[PDB]
Amino acid sequence: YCCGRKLEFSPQTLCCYGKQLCTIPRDATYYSYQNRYHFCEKCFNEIQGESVSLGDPQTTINKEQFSKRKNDTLDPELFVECTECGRKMHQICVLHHEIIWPAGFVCDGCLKKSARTRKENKFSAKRLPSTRLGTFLENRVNDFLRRQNHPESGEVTVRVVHASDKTVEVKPGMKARFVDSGEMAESFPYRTKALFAFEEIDGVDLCFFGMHVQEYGSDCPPPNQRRVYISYLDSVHFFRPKCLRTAVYHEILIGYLEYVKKLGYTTGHIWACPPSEGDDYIFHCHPPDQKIPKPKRLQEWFKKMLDKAVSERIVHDYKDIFKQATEDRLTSAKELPYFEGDFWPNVLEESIKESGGSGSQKLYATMEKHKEVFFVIRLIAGPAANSLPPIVDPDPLIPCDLMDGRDAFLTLARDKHLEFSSLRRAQWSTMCMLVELHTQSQD
Ligand SMILES: COc1ccc(C2(C(=O)N3C[C@H](F)C[C@@H]3C(=O)Nc3ccc4[nH]ncc4n3)CCCCC2)cc1
Ligand SMILES: [Zn+2]
Ligand SMILES: [Zn+2]
């Protein structure tokens, strides 16, 4: 071997299908049917008798048709063979990708000896199509890095890899309360964008940061107009050097707020919510020693980022949702911004049901309960906010199914055994992710 290391992939967490958002973690017992429908033991034993309705229509399958197993299968890492010396090498170690170098793998010893070099990887992060937004962000990050003069830092590339039109539909409880009486729009149009930051470490790209956002333009009816909502943020903690990692995250996030403020978006919204254990927002299979922040520390992290943005004159100010509503003299749930997949649409469904039909009953109490978790970020304030021209985004749409939401990228990593759990594995996953973004765009 190369490293002389016996390497195998770790078992990944699956879903249990018999409960919304349930999972089966490493080294857990589970029941599976056709390697497709998996059940945690609890979700299995809570099924009535021996009849499970399956599908994705209904197919009643008996319970004795399942296999009982433990989630502990260890797939060995793959090797590749040098087409000349026949040396066997971990594919991840040498980062050989059949699509980048179709003519076969040639080890570095055979390359140095013959004074040869690998043909250039034209499937790099750098060569992903650029945008006004991505350029604005990466200029900000690289200018910051060069101001720091740290010998270990590498060039950072920021790329927007998806942009498409969407709408968020008001859920049935709030629909029956406010939409059917005509007090609230039934849906809100927005544009979603996915963007990623890469760092060149030793001429090798590493994806270390990802973001999905929802941008509601000047055409959106209230209460959603001229607002951006950050759907998901994620990172892989291998940015080099470690002591600039947080500042780089801040530069990206503050730069994005600066950018949308320039286009005319008045307000930013952040739900400071950690993932639960074993759940990946964007990047599949995080490093074990990269810890999920607990809520209070995630909140303070966002507070520090926003405070720097305020002192930079980018953010005017920010408040929690409870304080924001009080100053806005809010009286009804219909006045709250209604975002896709956000907490408040879900809690308002439950609030209306438990109150027997009111849409204002526990509103302020619920906002006070959770206020520390919801940031309302004022970008454009006072009289300037009233006379704004239409929002015209210079960047075009970018159709890319792999990056339409977070799910397709998690599925690709699952299907191709990609992990972001170590530097070597995250570099390999970055290479495969880059190849996929380049080939999908070719179509
Ligand atoms: C105080 O400390 C922090 C460490 C990282 C962050 C950020 C961040 O990345 N995250 C916040 C959420 F927590 C999701 C993601 C995260 O930790 N995601 C992880 C991390 C480890 C994981 N293991 N398993 C899953 C899993 N998800 C860094 C990039 C910009 C967003 C804020 C913020 C604070
Ligand atoms: Zn190796
Ligand atoms: Zn379960």
Ligand SMILES: [Zn+2]
């Ligand atoms: Zn060789």
